[PDB]
Design a protein around this ligand. Structure first.
Ligand code: K
Ligand code: MG
Ligand code: MG
Ligand code: MG
Ligand code: MG
Ligand code: MG
Ligand code: MG
Ligand code: MG
Ligand code: MG
Ligand code: MG
Ligand code: MG
Ligand code: MG
Ligand code: MG
Ligand code: MG
Ligand code: MG
Ligand code: MG
Ligand code: MG
Ligand code: MG
Ligand code: MG
Ligand code: MG
Ligand code: MG
Ligand code: MG
Ligand code: MG
Ligand code: MG
Ligand code: MG
Ligand code: MG
Ligand code: MG
Ligand code: MG
Ligand code: MG
Ligand code: MG
Ligand code: MG
Ligand code: MG
Ligand code: MG
Ligand code: MG
Lengths: 63, 136, 386
RNA sequence: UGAACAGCCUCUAGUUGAUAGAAUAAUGUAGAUAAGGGAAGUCGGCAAAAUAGAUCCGUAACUUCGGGAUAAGGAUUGGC
RNA sequence: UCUUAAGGUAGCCAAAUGCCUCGUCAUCUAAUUAGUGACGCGCAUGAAUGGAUUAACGAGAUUCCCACUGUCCCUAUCUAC
RNA sequence: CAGUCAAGCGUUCAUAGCGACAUUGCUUUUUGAUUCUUCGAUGUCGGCUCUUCCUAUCAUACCGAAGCAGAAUUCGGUAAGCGUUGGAUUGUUCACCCACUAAUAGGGAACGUGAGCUGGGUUUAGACCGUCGUGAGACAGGUUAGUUUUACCCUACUGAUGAAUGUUACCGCAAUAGUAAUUGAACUUAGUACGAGAGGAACAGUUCAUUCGGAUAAUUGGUUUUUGCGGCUGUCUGAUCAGGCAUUGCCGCGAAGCUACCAUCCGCUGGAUUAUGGCUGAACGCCUCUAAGUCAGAAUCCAUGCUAGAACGCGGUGAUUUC
């Protein structure tokens, strides 16, 4: 019962939701859904995807 | 699972059937392992024996040291790459399929493991757990 | 000649015929064995499958790796508004079988149960039980005579109950009527427990308790006509097969010069009566209880209903049963929950379950918030201004 | 458009013909997609997939010296 | 020594030709009645009834490898008719 | 494939296990023998797929015997309930090997199964080779290429309706038929019993797993005409906006539904028996599990439980047409 944070979108991950990905260098990425997993696998920059936490932080939205 | 295995393994989704070539994660000299059998597998018509994380398999070496090639030897699967679900609800997977050459008792032929190792594999195989670096 | 490679049979010959069940309400075919010492009680209950959700709990299983660790489990919610007792049946033992002797109904019946006796309720003059209600004219002497007959005869006593379907988010309006056996106490005690519970309601917490193992009796989801590949699970034929590959290649030998009853053949899949057993009750929730979904570890003020409601069902306003795993039947389907037929001491039973968290994210998509307060606190202010 | 009488869209001209309506079971015929594995399938990789244009690199054995050769194997490509 | 008209030369080979036969050895594989390379008393190879080789070519036959994939593990789902 | 006898083997010893010389049978899964059926045609090998049956039992249950300390084995009884695999080479049946496994037992069903497939083989016409033949040609010799047709009828089977019973509605019973779960590992027992040592168990308990079955879709994954949102090419609507067409234009994501040991859950407890071991106990003053009587006791049987519900089996109950 730990609420994790999506490594791409910054979404909160509740138990049993999404996937966990272990990269070859043993770095762990958590994804809330297959949308975040797919954009990460497509090598999209989270800072250039308008609805992510990094994007809104970088462009100072809702602050 | 099998000889030298510490305890029982809760079921993991099978991702590696017979004929799968998985990377070789130790420093024995082999570059890959060709899965030819899975220890403890059941019997069903047309159903391939398939391995998962923490399973002992019988494998051959197709790339690597010539003294390691052309032989049948045990191996333990240390990274799966097929998504599996732990009891705590997490579905996870690695990039690649990896295993380490073992003896039938469960001691690693090599002395180091390259890359991460699944937690189920480390809990089953103490020699793998002691030789491993980062576990998941 | 012989088969040349052994393979187990496809399917189960004890679930035949794979035909549509005679009714949408699967019948309870065996009740728990009576114990005259215990107090008089119901043996089963009626409810409606709402949907499934997810929980997290600590596991108490010594010797297992996940002992004292958190486990995510699927559960099924059944909406169980209190049933209304409207009748009592007496059953006498005969060399031909258990035979109904008589039925006694309550003085007043509701419209939702009177609808069950009509195919066209709107056209009807609604004359049902009008002359029967006159048996209570002076002192219900006819009712007393029939109850006396049930006490004198009738080794087995069952009560007729009906659902309160009006309290569910269903369009049906026609309540379900069922017989539920009474276990405990003498025959006279059972007859009394029916008589002072006519037109009264029975709550689900008076029948089922926390951690109890119960059975689910329901008709399964319908799928219409199915071929053998999915109705029986046979091997698909090769890609090169002329005139179809979703078939059984050999449906019999030359002799016997017939197709066997045991050969897999296409036909109706689903809509079968199923009695599934050993489902553990994880929560008995109350309708008149805000924070149904709040636990000891949570204290997050939320009901059991997911955001946007249970998909295709609606919202849970009544009492409910949370059973581990899945039960036969689809959402909105009438399901009968029966007490366990035997005493289970397998230590997978009789293990006290304390929930830590109940999932209430939307099931209409990839729900990422549990409450609207959580959603508003995460997303901040939107253009839509409340 | 494009190397193009290729494929795709349009102008002039011509046609709008081929029994229809309703519903979307199984099995088909035609078209597709698939986690992980990757020929373990099968008599046999049958069938399908993968490759593919152009530019610039880089191309072995062998050879009748003409070839092999687009060998193999790589990089790039829009708009303004 | 017997007998022929003369006794199979150069080559080539369990070959699309070798019965025995799944020949023996090696290689290829975890494992090969398959493939390849050798061997040759060759049931019954062999020189324009052409022998041996051979670059290039082939909707010819065959074996292995890389890639690739629903061929398969093991199925599922969708569209039109 | 099984039996009878018992020379001999088995340190000692015919019969723990074997068992020569002989000899009695059984079976029809080999190959022959025959020519009764079919030549106005019964599609002729194998494999794939799928069901069932047999037992002469490989494994699993319970047992008896051993040259059974233990472990591991071997012989045998009840027993076919339940399983009996993945591959390399071969068209192969067979074989052989690799490997897992509790085990990789043997057979039948028109050498089960071609309007089920496939077409590798065999099995027309093309072609090559070797031998044979003057030759045309021959070759259960090799090689290569060679159209696999029809169900809409009857029955069977799988599912689906349905007249008739005063009508109609609801709640039920239960005859009959079906039936299901299976196997392993790890921990503990225990480095204990046993054994000089070497080695090395079992019952009770606990946690998982295999094979199978029934369901289910919270989650993860797959699927996409949600043609839902966005993107991209070509062309057309003068441009913009917004769209058409490219037989679903293509790409990304994609709810819902469906769905996967690719996901999750669940798969009962009583009685009577077999083999076998017994008690009491004669026959036969003794003995004896048997003759009378009787006690335990198997993956067996029958119930419990589960599925269907006789459309010519039954019950209870509601209303039963005022012009
Ligand atoms: K999905
Ligand atoms: Mg097969
Ligand atoms: Mg065909
Ligand atoms: Mg959902
Ligand atoms: Mg131009
Ligand atoms: Mg056009
Ligand atoms: Mg047309
Ligand atoms: Mg795939
Ligand atoms: Mg193969
Ligand atoms: Mg072959
Ligand atoms: Mg092709
Ligand atoms: Mg070349
Ligand atoms: Mg010579
Ligand atoms: Mg080969
Ligand atoms: Mg050769
Ligand atoms: Mg020769
Ligand atoms: Mg040509
Ligand atoms: Mg004759
Ligand atoms: Mg005839
Ligand atoms: Mg004739
Ligand atoms: Mg015929
Ligand atoms: Mg026997
Ligand atoms: Mg094969
Ligand atoms: Mg035949
Ligand atoms: Mg045919
Ligand atoms: Mg036939
Ligand atoms: Mg042929
Ligand atoms: Mg010919
Ligand atoms: Mg019965
Ligand atoms: Mg299923
Ligand atoms: Mg147009
Ligand atoms: Mg066109
Ligand atoms: Mg005695
Ligand atoms: Mg009836």
């Amino acid at each position: 019962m730990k609420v994790e944070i999506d490594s791409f979108s910054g979404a909160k991950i509740y138990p049993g939701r999404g996937t966990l990905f272990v990269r070859g260098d043993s770095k762990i990425f958590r994804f809330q859904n297959s949308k975040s997993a797919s954009l990460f696998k497509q090598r999209k920059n989270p800072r250039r995807i308008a609805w992510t936490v990094l994007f809104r932080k970088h462009h100072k939205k809702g602050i | 699972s099998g000889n030298g295995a510490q305890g029982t393994k809760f079921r993991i989704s099978l991702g590696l059937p017979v004929g799968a070539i998985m990377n070789c994660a130790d420093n024995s000299g082999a570059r890959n392992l060709y899965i030819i059998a899975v220890k403890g597998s059941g019997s069903r018509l047309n159903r391939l024996p398939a391995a998962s994380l923490g399973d002992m398999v019988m494998a051959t070496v197709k790339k690597g040291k010539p003294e390691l090639r052309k032989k049948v030897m045990p191996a333990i699967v240390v990274r799966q790459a097929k998504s599996w679900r732990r009891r705590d609800g997490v579905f996870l997977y690695f990039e690649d399929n990896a295993g380490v050459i073992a003896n039938p008792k469960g001691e690693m032929k090599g002395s180091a493991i390259t890359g991460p190792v699944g937690k189920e594999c480390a809990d089953l195989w103490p020699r793998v757990a002691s030789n491993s670096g980062v576990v998941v | 000649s012989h088969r040349k490679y052994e393979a187990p049979r496809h399917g189960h010959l004890g679930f035949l015929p794979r035909k549509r069940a005679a009714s949408i309400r699967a019948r309870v075919k065996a009740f728990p064995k009576d114990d005259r010492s215990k107090p008089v009680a119901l043996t089963s209950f009626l409810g409606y499958k709402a949907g499934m959700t997810t929980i997290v709990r600590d596991l108490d299983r010594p010797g297992s790796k996940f002992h004292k660790r958190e486990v995510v489990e699927a559960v099924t919610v059944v909406d169980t508004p209190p049933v209304v007792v409207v009748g009592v049946v007496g059953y006498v033992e005969t060399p031909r079988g258990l035979r109904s002797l008589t039925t006694v109904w309550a003085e007043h019946l509701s419209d939702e149960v009177k609808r069950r006796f009509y195919k066209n309720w709107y056209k009807s003059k609604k004359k049902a039980f009008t002359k029967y209600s006159a048996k209570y004219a002076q002192d219900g002497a006819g009712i007393e005579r029939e109850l006396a007959r049930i006490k004198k005869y009738a080794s087995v006593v069952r009560v007729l109950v009906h659902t309160q379907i009006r309290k569910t988010p269903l369009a049906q309006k026609k309540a379900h009527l069922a017989e539920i056996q009474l276990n405990g106490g003498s025959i006279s005690e059972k007859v009394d427990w029916a008589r002072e519970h006519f037109e009264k309601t029975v709550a689900v917490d008076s029948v089922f308790e926390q951690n109890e193992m119960i059975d689910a009796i329901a008709v399964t989801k319908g799928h219409g006509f199915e071929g053998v590949t999915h109705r029986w699970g046979t091997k698909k034929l090769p890609r090169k097969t002329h005139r179809g590959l979703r078939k059984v290649a050999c449906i019999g030998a030359w002799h016997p010069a017939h197709v066997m009853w045991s050969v897999a053949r296409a036909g109706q899949r689903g809509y079968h009566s199923r009695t599934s057993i050993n489902h553990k009750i994880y929560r008995v929730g109350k309708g008149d209880d805000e924070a149904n979904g709040a636990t000891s570890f949570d204290r997050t003020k939320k009901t059991i209903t997911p955001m946007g409601g249970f998909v295709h069902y609606g919202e849970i306003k009544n009492d409910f049963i949370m059973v581990k795993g899945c039960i036969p039947g689809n959402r909105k389907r009438i399901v009968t929950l029966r007490k366990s037929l035997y005493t289970n001491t397998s230590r997978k039973a009789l293990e006290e379950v304390s929930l830590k968290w109940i999932d209430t994210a939307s099931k209409f998509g990839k729900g990422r918030f549990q409450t609207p307060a959580e959603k508003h606190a995460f997303m901040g202010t939107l253009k839509k201004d409340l």
